[PDB]
């Protein structure tokens with residue numbers, strides 16, 4: 001089917017507080033009469049781009065922010081429109097994580113980082129280093145226990161150890177990522193994955209262990225430690241295991257460096273319910289009461305909402321979470337993240353299962369990511385060329401229109417027309433000598449067709465106007481067709497050049 005007008009469908013991962021979120025949905029339905037249906041499909045992060053490209057899927061998708069730049073580039077997410085008053089309700093750094101090409105593409109919900117979770121009755125004192133763990137596992141087998149179990153199927157859980165001694169995804173220097181500098185097969189990444197492979201080789205961990213297997217072992221007290229995020233605390237609470245939440249152990253004297261996620265809520269570009277989605281997210285979910293309902297189901301981590309974080313921050317489990325977060329790094333949201341995760345997933349599973357060697361595994365991953373970065377570079381180049389061409393076309397149409405020139409109070413005399421200035425917004429942080437990105441946002445419609453939106457200024461000596469355009473891809477291999485173009489000049493009514 002296709003997205004249904006007049007209700008909301010929400011997708012969120014099955015490890016999160018989806019029941020709590022449904023409760024917030026029910027409140028919205030009681031107050032407004034709008035039905036909110038929460039679903040938690042498997043492989044949500046892979047299903048969404050498939051269905052959203054055919055105008056299907058949820059109105060709202062929840063995932064960590066790392067997936068969202070990819071979705072935005074593909075036109076699957078609507079730019080969100082929160083006013084200044086609302087934006088002020090959330091921490092600036094959380095908004096930063098959902099910024100793509102300088103625009104907001106989702107609402108931040110909560111900061112997630114992995115910590116070491118330990119059973120206090122089995123280990124009153126948790127180990128400071130990865131290195132102590134094999135000896136620890138020896139003392140525990142004698143009591144039939146084991147030292148450590150965590151999900152070896154998802155590289156999110158293995159990444160902190162790979163990064164510890166020097167591994168990195170993309171070289172982050174000052175503000176920008178150099179995607180041509182990937183650190184997944186450097187000496188640092190090798191040591192970490194090697195050490196993990198050794199735990200398995202030496203039978204302290206089993207390569208087949210996944211999320212549910214690790215969680216069950218810890219929650220039943222069969223293993224003394226696990227590695228997991230805030231969402232997992234709720235089930236441990238139920239289990240009546242006495243647990244602490246603490247800093248990940250060091251590797252080679254250095255902190256484990258978890259990749260930190262900001263759980264975020266994006267609106268499907270193809271949804272006919274964008275204003276309902278906005279109202280739900282801003283007025284119901286991102287409230288103390290709304291986040292409480294979700295958090296009480298499964299802990300969110302450190303929430304983006306300042307007023308409610310003030311309550312949560314008291315929790316030592318949250319302090320531990322933020323302490324691991326500060327030792328790690330906020331994930332990029334660049335579109336190459338999906339490729340990075342796929343490559344590293346295959347590397348870890350292949351190296352764990354003894355299939356490929358560590359050096360074979362990481363080389364293949366590195367090659368894959370480098371290849372993905374190369375095509376991604378070409379794609380960005382094509383996009384800038386295309387945007388430049390769109391801007392140039394609209395500048396021509398605007399500048400040649402006699403009514404618009406009159407509104408701009410152009411000085412057109414016998415020598416010729418006044419040369420007009422055209423430049424991008426505006427307002428997009430630190431691009432001076434009037435040198436600005438001139439970038440379009442992309443949205444798919446319910447038919448799956450690509451629309452390009454662009455805003456820019458045109459300036460005469462007397463007036464500065466703001467131009468908005470919307471172009472639609474042709475079914476041919478033609479240039480995009482302009483379907484809406486209008487100009488706002490201070491003092492004057494909006495002028496529609498194309499209605």
Ligand SMILES: OC[C@H]1O[C@H](O[C@H]2[C@H](O)[C@@H](O)[C@@H](O)O[C@@H]2CO)[C@H](O)[C@@H](O)[C@@H]1O
Pocket residue numbers: 013015045063064065066067112154155156157261341
């Ligand atoms: O393992 C690769 C996977 O890592 C992250 O996913 C985390 C997610 O952020 C957490 O919220 C929780 O659901 O566990 C997931 C790992 O299973 C990235 O967000 C994701 O893109 C990536 O594929």
